[PDB]
Swiss-Prot record, chains A, B:
E3 ubiquitin-protein ligase that mediates ubiquitination and subsequent proteasomal degradation of myosin regulatory light chain (MRLC), LDLR, VLDLR and LRP8. Activity depends on E2 enzymes of the UBE2D family. Proteasomal degradation of MRLC leads to inhibit neurite outgrowth in presence of NGF by counteracting the stabilization of MRLC by saposin-like protein (CNPY2/MSAP) and reducing CNPY2-stimulated neurite outgrowth. Acts as a sterol-dependent inhibitor of cellular cholesterol uptake by mediating ubiquitination and subsequent degradation of LDLR. This is E3 ubiquitin-protein ligase MYLIP. The RING domain mediates ubiquitination and the neurite outgrowth inhibitory activity. Residues 64-66 are annotated as: Critical for homodimerization. The chain holds residues 369 to 436 of 445 of the full protein. A zinc finger (RING-type) spans 20-55.
Length: 69, 69
């Protein structure tokens, strides 16, 4: 039904929000510290000096294990 | 249709996976460091001395800003 299409769209958008903002291919699994922005996969987070969201210096990257992984 | 019920179940389970594993009421927004398990809201995370997934000591809690928030 049209309701099935609405639910498909909601699911698709939630799933896309869990993907890396740089490569758009891998799941987010890394946090920039200390700002806390958690928006990249490990590979894309590895060489950034500053956060791509807030420009704060990245002191280190914390790996995150999320139940949605 | 029956597919509407299946999609509602998939959406409900994905949303439940983003809720705190301890209180079941608030969104996950906190990481236990250094283990990386990201399974609690800020209120339950503040009250735990050991990670509820792996039992490692919590040195500190990092707030995470996720695009799914
Ligand atoms: C964003 C809320 C999540 N946990 C409850 C808190 C009450 O101030 C804040
Ligand atoms: Zn990436
Ligand atoms: Zn940031
Ligand atoms: Zn909680
Ligand atoms: Zn842990």
């Amino acid at each position: 039904s049209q309701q099935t299409r609405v639910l498909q769209e909601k699911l698709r958008k939630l799933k896309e929000a869990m993907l890396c903002m740089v490569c758009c291919e891998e799941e987010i699994n890394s946090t920039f510290c200390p700002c806390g922005h958690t928006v990249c996969c490990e590979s894309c987070a590895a060489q950034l000096q500053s956060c791509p969201v807030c420009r704060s210096r990245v002191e280190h990257v914390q790996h995150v294990y999320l139940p949605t992984h």
